[PDB]
Coordinates of C-alpha atoms and ligand atoms in Angstrom, one line a residue:
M1 CA 0.0 0.0 0.0
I2 CA 1.6 3.2 -1.3
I3 CA 2.2 6.2 1.0
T4 CA 0.5 9.3 -0.3
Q5 CA 1.1 11.9 2.3
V6 CA 2.4 12.4 5.8
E7 CA 1.3 15.1 8.3
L8 CA 3.5 16.3 11.2
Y9 CA 2.2 18.2 14.2
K10 CA 3.7 20.1 17.1
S11 CA 1.9 18.8 20.2
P12 CA 2.9 20.7 23.4
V13 CA 0.8 19.8 26.4
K14 CA 1.4 21.4 29.9
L15 CA 2.1 19.2 32.9
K16 CA 0.2 19.6 36.2
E17 CA 3.3 19.7 38.3
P18 CA 6.8 20.3 36.9
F19 CA 8.7 17.1 36.2
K20 CA 12.1 17.0 37.7
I21 CA 15.2 14.8 37.1
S22 CA 18.9 15.1 37.9
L23 CA 19.3 16.4 34.3
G24 CA 16.7 19.2 34.5
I25 CA 13.2 20.4 35.0
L26 CA 10.3 20.2 32.5
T27 CA 7.0 22.1 32.4
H28 CA 5.6 20.8 29.2
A29 CA 5.7 17.6 27.1
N30 CA 6.7 19.0 23.8
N31 CA 5.9 16.1 21.4
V32 CA 5.8 15.7 17.7
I33 CA 2.9 13.7 16.1
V34 CA 3.2 11.8 12.8
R35 CA 0.3 10.7 10.5
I36 CA 1.0 8.6 7.5
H37 CA -1.7 8.3 4.8
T38 CA -2.1 5.5 2.2
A39 CA -3.7 5.6 -1.2
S40 CA -6.3 3.1 0.2
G41 CA -7.1 5.8 2.8
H42 CA -5.6 4.1 5.9
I43 CA -4.0 6.3 8.5
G44 CA -1.1 5.3 10.8
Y45 CA -0.2 7.3 13.9
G46 CA 3.2 7.7 15.5
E47 CA 4.3 10.0 18.3
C48 CA 7.6 11.0 19.8
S49 CA 8.8 13.0 22.7
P50 CA 12.1 14.7 22.1
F51 CA 14.2 15.1 25.2
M52 CA 17.1 17.5 24.6
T53 CA 19.6 16.3 27.2
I54 CA 19.2 12.6 26.1
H55 CA 18.0 12.4 22.5
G56 CA 19.8 15.5 21.4
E57 CA 16.6 16.4 19.6
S58 CA 13.9 18.9 20.3
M59 CA 10.3 19.4 19.2
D60 CA 11.7 22.0 16.8
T61 CA 14.4 19.8 15.3
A62 CA 12.1 16.8 15.1
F63 CA 9.5 18.8 13.2
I64 CA 12.1 19.7 10.6
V65 CA 13.9 16.4 10.3
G66 CA 10.6 14.7 10.1
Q67 CA 9.9 16.5 6.9
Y68 CA 13.2 15.3 5.4
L69 CA 11.9 11.8 6.3
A70 CA 8.4 12.2 5.1
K71 CA 9.7 13.3 1.7
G72 CA 11.7 10.2 1.2
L73 CA 8.8 8.0 2.3
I74 CA 6.3 9.4 -0.1
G75 CA 5.6 6.7 -2.8
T76 CA 6.9 3.8 -0.9
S77 CA 5.1 0.7 0.4
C78 CA 4.2 1.2 4.1
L79 CA 4.6 -2.6 4.5
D80 CA 8.3 -2.6 3.8
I81 CA 9.1 -1.6 7.3
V82 CA 12.8 -2.6 7.2
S83 CA 13.3 -1.1 3.8
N84 CA 11.8 2.2 4.9
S85 CA 13.7 2.3 8.2
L86 CA 16.9 1.9 6.1
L87 CA 15.7 4.6 3.7
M88 CA 15.4 7.0 6.6
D89 CA 18.8 6.1 8.0
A90 CA 20.2 6.9 4.5
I91 CA 18.5 10.3 4.7
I92 CA 20.0 11.3 8.1
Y93 CA 22.1 9.7 10.8
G94 CA 20.8 9.5 14.4
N95 CA 17.6 11.4 15.1
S96 CA 16.1 8.2 16.5
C97 CA 13.4 10.0 18.4
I98 CA 11.7 11.4 15.3
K99 CA 12.5 8.2 13.3
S100 CA 10.7 6.2 16.0
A101 CA 7.5 8.1 15.3
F102 CA 7.6 7.2 11.7
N103 CA 8.5 3.6 12.6
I104 CA 5.6 3.3 15.0
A105 CA 3.2 4.6 12.4
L106 CA 4.4 2.2 9.8
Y107 CA 3.7 -0.7 12.2
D108 CA 0.4 0.8 12.8
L109 CA -0.5 0.5 9.1
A110 CA 1.1 -3.0 8.9
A111 CA -1.0 -4.2 11.8
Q112 CA -4.1 -2.6 10.4
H113 CA -3.4 -4.4 7.1
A114 CA -3.2 -7.8 8.8
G115 CA -6.3 -7.1 10.8
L116 CA -4.5 -7.6 14.1
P117 CA -3.7 -5.4 17.1
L118 CA 0.0 -4.4 17.2
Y119 CA 0.9 -6.8 20.0
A120 CA -0.4 -9.7 18.1
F121 CA 1.1 -8.6 14.8
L122 CA 4.4 -8.6 16.6
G123 CA 3.8 -12.2 17.8
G124 CA 2.9 -11.2 21.4
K125 CA 0.1 -12.4 23.6
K126 CA -1.8 -11.1 26.7
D127 CA -0.3 -13.5 29.2
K128 CA 0.8 -11.1 31.9
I129 CA -0.4 -8.1 33.8
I130 CA 1.2 -4.8 32.9
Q131 CA 1.6 -2.6 36.0
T132 CA 3.1 0.8 35.9
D133 CA 5.1 2.6 38.5
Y134 CA 4.7 6.3 39.2
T135 CA 7.5 8.8 39.5
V136 CA 8.6 11.0 42.3
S137 CA 10.4 14.1 41.0
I138 CA 13.8 14.9 42.4
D139 CA 13.2 17.7 45.0
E140 CA 13.7 18.6 48.6
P141 CA 13.3 15.4 50.7
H142 CA 10.2 16.5 52.6
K143 CA 8.4 17.3 49.3
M144 CA 9.6 13.9 47.9
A145 CA 8.2 12.0 50.8
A146 CA 4.9 13.9 50.6
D147 CA 4.5 12.9 46.9
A148 CA 5.5 9.3 47.6
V149 CA 2.6 9.3 50.1
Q150 CA 0.0 10.8 47.7
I151 CA 1.1 8.2 45.2
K152 CA 0.6 5.3 47.6
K153 CA -2.8 6.8 48.5
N154 CA -3.8 6.9 44.8
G155 CA -3.2 3.2 44.8
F156 CA 0.1 2.8 42.9
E157 CA 2.0 -0.3 44.1
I158 CA 5.4 0.7 42.6
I159 CA 7.2 4.0 43.1
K160 CA 10.1 5.2 40.9
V161 CA 12.3 7.8 42.6
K162 CA 14.5 10.3 40.8
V163 CA 17.9 10.5 42.5
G164 CA 21.2 11.8 41.3
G165 CA 22.2 14.5 43.8
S166 CA 24.9 14.4 46.5
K167 CA 25.3 11.0 48.2
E168 CA 24.2 12.6 51.5
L169 CA 21.0 14.1 50.0
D170 CA 19.9 11.0 48.0
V171 CA 20.1 8.8 51.1
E172 CA 18.1 11.3 53.1
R173 CA 15.6 11.2 50.2
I174 CA 15.2 7.4 50.1
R175 CA 15.1 7.1 53.9
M176 CA 12.4 9.9 54.4
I177 CA 10.4 8.1 51.7
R178 CA 10.8 4.6 53.1
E179 CA 9.9 5.8 56.6
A180 CA 7.0 7.9 55.3
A181 CA 5.5 5.3 53.0
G182 CA 6.4 1.8 54.0
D183 CA 8.7 -1.1 53.4
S184 CA 6.3 -3.3 51.6
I185 CA 5.7 -1.0 48.6
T186 CA 8.2 -1.9 45.9
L187 CA 10.5 1.0 44.9
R188 CA 13.0 1.6 42.1
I189 CA 15.4 4.5 41.6
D190 CA 16.8 6.5 38.7
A191 CA 19.9 8.7 38.7
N192 CA 19.9 9.9 35.1
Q193 CA 23.7 9.8 35.0
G194 CA 23.8 12.0 38.2
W195 CA 26.6 10.4 40.1
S196 CA 30.3 9.9 39.6
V197 CA 31.5 6.3 39.6
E198 CA 32.8 6.9 43.1
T199 CA 29.6 8.6 44.5
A200 CA 27.6 5.9 42.8
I201 CA 29.1 2.9 44.6
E202 CA 29.1 4.8 47.9
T203 CA 25.4 5.8 47.6
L204 CA 24.3 2.5 46.3
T205 CA 25.7 0.6 49.2
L206 CA 24.4 3.2 51.6
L207 CA 21.0 2.6 50.1
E208 CA 20.9 -1.2 50.0
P209 CA 19.3 -1.4 53.5
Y210 CA 16.2 0.4 52.1
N211 CA 15.5 -2.6 49.8
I212 CA 15.4 -1.0 46.3
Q213 CA 14.5 -3.0 43.2
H214 CA 17.0 -1.6 40.7
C215 CA 18.8 1.6 39.8
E216 CA 18.6 3.1 36.4
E217 CA 21.7 4.7 34.8
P218 CA 23.8 5.7 37.9
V219 CA 26.6 7.3 36.0
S220 CA 27.4 9.1 32.7
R221 CA 26.5 7.2 29.6
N222 CA 30.1 8.0 28.6
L223 CA 31.4 5.9 31.4
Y224 CA 29.5 2.8 30.6
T225 CA 32.8 0.9 30.8
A226 CA 32.8 1.6 34.6
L227 CA 29.4 -0.1 34.9
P228 CA 30.8 -3.7 35.4
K229 CA 32.8 -2.4 38.3
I230 CA 29.7 -0.8 39.9
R231 CA 27.6 -3.9 39.2
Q232 CA 30.0 -6.1 41.2
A233 CA 30.5 -3.6 44.0
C234 CA 26.8 -3.1 44.8
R235 CA 24.0 -5.4 45.8
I236 CA 21.1 -3.4 44.2
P237 CA 20.8 -4.3 40.5
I238 CA 21.6 -1.7 38.0
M239 CA 19.6 -1.0 34.9
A240 CA 21.1 0.7 31.8
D241 CA 18.9 3.4 30.3
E242 CA 20.7 6.2 28.4
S243 CA 23.6 3.7 28.1
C244 CA 21.4 1.3 26.2
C245 CA 19.8 2.9 23.1
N246 CA 20.1 0.5 20.2
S247 CA 20.9 -3.2 19.7
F248 CA 24.6 -2.5 19.3
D249 CA 24.7 -0.8 22.6
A250 CA 22.9 -3.7 24.1
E251 CA 25.3 -6.3 22.8
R252 CA 28.3 -4.2 24.0
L253 CA 26.9 -3.9 27.5
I254 CA 26.2 -7.6 27.7
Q255 CA 29.7 -8.4 26.4
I256 CA 31.4 -6.7 29.3
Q257 CA 28.6 -7.6 31.7
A258 CA 27.8 -4.0 32.5
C259 CA 24.4 -4.3 34.1
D260 CA 21.6 -6.5 35.3
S261 CA 18.8 -5.2 33.2
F262 CA 17.8 -2.8 30.4
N263 CA 15.3 0.1 30.2
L264 CA 13.9 -0.2 26.7
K265 CA 12.4 2.9 25.0
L266 CA 11.2 3.0 21.4
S267 CA 12.7 6.6 20.9
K268 CA 16.2 5.3 21.7
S269 CA 16.0 2.4 19.3
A270 CA 14.4 4.5 16.5
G271 CA 11.3 2.4 16.6
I272 CA 9.9 -1.1 17.1
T273 CA 12.1 -2.8 14.5
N274 CA 15.3 -2.4 16.5
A275 CA 13.6 -2.6 19.9
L276 CA 12.8 -6.2 18.9
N277 CA 16.5 -6.9 18.6
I278 CA 17.3 -5.5 22.0
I279 CA 14.6 -7.7 23.4
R280 CA 16.0 -10.8 21.7
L281 CA 19.4 -10.1 23.2
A282 CA 18.0 -9.6 26.6
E283 CA 16.3 -12.9 26.3
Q284 CA 19.4 -14.8 25.3
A285 CA 21.2 -13.2 28.2
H286 CA 18.3 -13.9 30.7
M287 CA 18.1 -10.1 31.5
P288 CA 14.9 -8.6 32.8
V289 CA 13.7 -5.6 30.6
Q290 CA 11.7 -2.6 31.8
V291 CA 9.8 -0.8 29.0
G292 CA 9.6 2.9 29.5
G293 CA 9.5 6.3 27.7
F294 CA 9.8 10.0 27.9
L295 CA 6.9 12.4 27.8
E296 CA 4.8 10.7 25.2
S297 CA 1.0 10.9 25.5
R298 CA -1.0 7.7 25.8
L299 CA -0.5 7.2 22.1
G300 CA 3.2 6.8 22.4
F301 CA 2.9 4.6 25.5
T302 CA 0.3 2.5 23.7
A303 CA 3.0 1.5 21.3
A304 CA 5.3 0.8 24.2
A305 CA 2.6 -1.3 25.8
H306 CA 2.0 -3.4 22.6
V307 CA 5.7 -4.1 22.5
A308 CA 5.7 -5.0 26.2
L309 CA 3.6 -8.0 25.4
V310 CA 6.2 -9.5 23.0
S311 CA 8.4 -11.3 25.4
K312 CA 8.3 -12.8 29.0
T313 CA 11.7 -11.2 29.7
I314 CA 9.9 -7.8 29.8
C315 CA 8.5 -7.5 33.3
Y316 CA 8.8 -3.9 34.6
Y317 CA 6.8 -1.0 33.2
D318 CA 7.2 2.8 33.5
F319 CA 4.3 4.4 31.7
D320 CA 3.3 7.2 34.1
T321 CA 4.0 10.5 32.4
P322 CA 0.7 10.7 30.5
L323 CA -1.0 10.9 33.9
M324 CA 0.9 14.1 34.5
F325 CA -0.7 15.9 31.5
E326 CA -3.2 18.7 32.2
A327 CA -5.3 17.2 29.4
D328 CA -5.6 13.9 27.6
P329 CA -5.8 14.4 23.8
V330 CA -5.6 10.8 22.9
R331 CA -8.6 8.8 21.5
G332 CA -8.5 5.1 22.5
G333 CA -5.2 3.6 23.4
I334 CA -4.2 2.0 26.7
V335 CA -6.4 2.6 29.7
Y336 CA -5.2 3.1 33.2
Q337 CA -7.0 1.0 35.8
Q338 CA -6.6 0.9 39.6
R339 CA -3.3 -0.1 41.1
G340 CA -1.7 1.2 37.9
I341 CA -2.7 -1.8 35.9
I342 CA -2.6 -1.1 32.2
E343 CA -5.0 -2.6 29.6
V344 CA -3.9 -2.8 25.9
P345 CA -6.3 -2.2 23.0
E346 CA -7.4 -5.2 21.0
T347 CA -8.6 -3.6 17.9
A348 CA -6.5 -3.7 14.7
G349 CA -3.4 -1.5 14.5
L350 CA -2.0 0.7 17.2
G351 CA -5.5 1.0 18.6
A352 CA -5.1 4.7 19.3
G353 CA -5.4 8.1 17.7
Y354 CA -6.1 11.7 18.6
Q355 CA -9.3 13.4 19.7
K356 CA -11.3 15.1 17.0
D357 CA -10.0 18.6 16.1
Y358 CA -7.4 18.4 18.7
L359 CA -5.1 17.9 15.8
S360 CA -6.7 20.7 13.8
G361 CA -5.7 23.2 16.5
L362 CA -2.0 22.2 16.2
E363 CA 0.8 23.9 14.3
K364 CA 1.2 21.5 11.4
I365 CA 2.8 20.8 8.1
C366 CA 1.9 18.4 5.4
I367 CA 4.3 16.6 3.0
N368 CA 3.1 15.6 -0.4
Ligands
MG1 MG1 16.2 6.3 33.1

């Protein structure tokens, strides 16, 4: 089925509370939306959420590069996913974030064509419960404990805590939380490259008593070679996030035994196609995978959720940010139930789209 036009949209939605990590503070989710049209009149949706300090892309750059990409895709068969992913790579290096949106949309169309929901089109099955955590922003420790409480009250059974400050402060943070919210509630932490190799090892051993599930990206992605040293000198398991973007990164990390688990994100792998490779590797190496994201709406996370059902090695889920939006512009897609349990669409394709004339109010361009 030939691709006849693609539309790109700037989708900036404000967050209720500012979102805070060791790398910076965000007030908005500044996403880019992608709609691919076929001659047969099918429409595929993709979304991406550029994060400047990690992707090295922005809503502004994504909106431009996306046009380069659309141009090259016009006239091609939306079913040749691999061919088209290569085509995009030939147009521009990197820019995985925006590429992922195109990729996701292509799979949407592919699943639609097959008359299956994405998860089934990928060979997955609904044989496990998807339960999301919820994220406490890095802040003054009292604030952080307060939030942790509210979160527990709202019924979430898994908390993800943003650390990455001084060793002293991060420990005060986890303690105040643990003593203000309980020892039964499972909690995981994320440094976003915040610590030095030194500070990491010291803080991670000082934190072990508080029973934490795993720690995401404790040090600079540039120092991934120091990960194996940290993995061995620290009980708590460490999960590679920024350090694991594509399948090559994954293989390299496995090779030097850098970490215990991965955090898989479709933006980092430039779409579903390569995410599948990372998953395979994680399987062969008996490594648990957490699927997560950035500030995608429920449309983006619906794609993540479909992919989450592809392999039993995936068993942790971080799909919370859409709940932080002032307003939900998505039509269909994953639904959040109590306890943070996620339910995946069963209709053909992605199983999500955007609310009527939400799109029409957006700054947009259209590639013929
Ligand atoms: Mg992370």
